[PDB]
Amino acid sequence: TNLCPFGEVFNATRFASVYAWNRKRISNCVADYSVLYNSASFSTFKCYGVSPTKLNDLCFTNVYADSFVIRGDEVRQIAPGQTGKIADYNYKLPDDFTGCVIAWNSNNLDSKVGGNYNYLYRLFRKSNLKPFERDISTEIYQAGSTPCNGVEGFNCYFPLQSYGFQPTNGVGYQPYRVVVLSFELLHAPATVCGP
Amino acid sequence: STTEEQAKTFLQKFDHEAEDLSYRSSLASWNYNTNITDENVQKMNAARAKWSAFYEEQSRIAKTYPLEEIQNLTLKRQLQALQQSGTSVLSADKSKRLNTILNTMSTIYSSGKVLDPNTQEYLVLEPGLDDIMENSEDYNRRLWAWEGWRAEVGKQLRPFYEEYVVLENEMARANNYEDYGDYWRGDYEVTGADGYDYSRNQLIADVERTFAEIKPLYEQLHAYVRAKLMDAYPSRISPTGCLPAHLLGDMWGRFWTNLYPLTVPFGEKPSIDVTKEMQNQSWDAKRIFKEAEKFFVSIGLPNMTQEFWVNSMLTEPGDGRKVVCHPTAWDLGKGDFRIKMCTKVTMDDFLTAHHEMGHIQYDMAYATQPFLLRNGANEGFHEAVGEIMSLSAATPHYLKALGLLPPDFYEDNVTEINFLLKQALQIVGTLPFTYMLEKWRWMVFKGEIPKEQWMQKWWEMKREIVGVVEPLPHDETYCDPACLFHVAEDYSFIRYYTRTIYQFQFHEALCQTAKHEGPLYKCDISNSTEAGQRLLQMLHLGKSEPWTLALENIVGVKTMDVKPLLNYFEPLLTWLKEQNRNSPVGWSTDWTPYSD
Ligand SMILES: [Zn+2]
């Protein structure tokens, strides 16, 4: 009854695009942090502000989980202080971010012969995205000083681009499902407390 | 915004689509070359058509951005590669005509066949006349194979090649080039740097300046080979005359490697071969690549990727698929590097698994560069990086360390001159042919060779530069150069001349950094990490920086230099100058085999 729905978010059949990253607010969680730590199947497991030890004494107001499928070489761009196309335009983490980042390779799950072009990322944006901000706008990016008028023309490119996920690419160019866990701290009943 | 911001955004747009449109075409050529079928060729043409159409239409958009308004060095080189397109500046009628001519030439060459005394044979070039040319020592049979191939392929390609020259000289002039021989020299052109500027007319200066020093070394080798051929072919070659073309151990004479059995310096002493030794140690078709990787890991280069082993056809598949077994390295893109070679484990397959695995190490190094700047600094750097690994892997020191030679192996002066002379028939025996062939096409495009003197100036140069005389008199009807694979399929051939010069500039520089104490042909850069931290300072650059600057990073000079090549063959030259004391050195153009 109080089991944490990690399986719903960590083992969904299909993840969301990088720009349209899904946010799920989960409450009443008795979280087994050990199984996530001892999964032995996560390619990248970097935790910011929390030691790899259990640290179950502290309780948090709420926990947020974000889902997306970035490329393999773009996992480095997701960290406090990092910059890049994913960090600046798609998903930005604040310098004072407190949470845990979990990533694992997703080849043979998000890859198919021909290319799994369903996933989309934002390549061109007018300004850097704020921390924890989300954008779904499909307005044509204007690079020049001419009206785009909502059509792809010279200096007018569609901001969203499609990942090419083949099953034969290298480790850098292979899909990587990443889940970012955030820690909320404020005055609240704190329904989700560690055992 | 400024043009720099309007072009940096444009290049980012290009990279995303290009990195996944070229890869799909690269995953269709690979599938066809690993499984030939009727559907695969259709997919290969369909996939490449999209990439070919995409590349040209993006080049037109790139030309809208003024190049001079870009103040970023790393951004100009991408626009230069993108803007400088070819065959898109001609009329749609002429562009269609050019591909019609360029495809008939590539068809006549492959379909060429000649009549045998066993008439119903129709011998193709390979397998076929290559075996006759590279293994036989019969004067009469080789002449039939030589003249026969040039009678069929040469005569038919002549009408097409004459229209190939004029059409390719219209594309070049419309693209602001003097001739089509100037478009090919544009790969060596640097016009943005100060103190690293290389012009398209300076390549001719350096190619003809580095060949004025090879000639003293080539004359000694030519004299020695000529002396040995007289023993093999008595009363067939004049002592002071030129060498007949059909006696060079090849269909065209490019490589003299097949003249080694006739020209062994010490016939009693066998060469250093580990073909039988590898079989005695149960060396599988995969053990070679595992051992070849250990060589690159020893010098500090990165290991091969895990996906490389699974996706590469290291061994011939048992299934009856029509695999093209030409050994090549594939830079598919998207982090996928593959080598296509059906291993038939043999010493030569252990010295060519270091050359193909030297192309990947070059490809893997500039994978962090922008997509447009992912290639060799010039066309002569990608084939030279792989070859310097063959030099290190062919030394007896490298083989002895691995255990393929007995621990008490004795290196005497006899085997030192057998290895050096086996390398001279391939390294310094192809330069006069490579230089003369490219010098002929350069003048044909330029106009120094009129339409009526194509086969007159082809043999005047060959009898003067190469030292090779016509086995039979050829009139204008023949087209001897077109019989070569590269000439008939619109491929440059100065790549194989600069490659040889860059081979030993890299090799000497690495051996100097490896603290090598002795001759330059015994150098083995293996187990030395200071020769992989200086070679990788040019590998990482790719095409981002001018080849003159990339050359100085590893070698230390900005100019093509043949001095390291002579140092490598210096021990051989001393022996060659003591074996030619009783024989004439040099060739006379007057003598011809058909005169008598
Ligand atoms: Zn090669």
Author numbering:
A (entry chain B): 333 to 527
B (entry chain A): 19 to 614
The authors write:
SARS-CoV-2 uses the receptor-binding domain (RBD) in the S protein to interact with angiotensin-converting enzyme 2 (ACE2), which is also the receptor of SARS-CoV. Then, we chose minke whale ACE2 and sea lion ACE2, which displayed high binding affinities to both RBDs, for further study and determined their cryo-electron microscopy (cryo-EM) structures in complex with either SARS-CoV-2 RBD or SARS-CoV RBD.
MW-ACE2/SARS-CoV-2 RBD and SL-ACE2/SARS-CoV-2 RBD display similar architectures to hACE2 in complex with SARS-CoV-2 RBD, with root mean squared deviations (RMSDs) of 0.995 Å and 0.594 Å, respectively. The side chain of R42 on MW-ACE2, though much longer than Q42 on hACE2, is bent away from its interacting residues on the SARS-CoV-2 RBD and fails to form any polar interactions, while Q42 on hACE2 forms three H-bonds with the RBD. Substitution of G326 on hACE2 with its MW-ACE2 counterpart E325 brings with it a longer side chain, which forms additional interactions with the RBD and expands the binding interface. On the SARS-CoV-2 RBD, E484 and F490 exclusively interact with hACE2, while S477, S494, Y495, V503 and Q506 only interact with MW-ACE2 but not hACE2. In the MW-ACE2/SARS-CoV-2 RBD complex, the L79I and M82T substitutions do not change the conformation of F486 on the SARS-CoV-2 RBD.
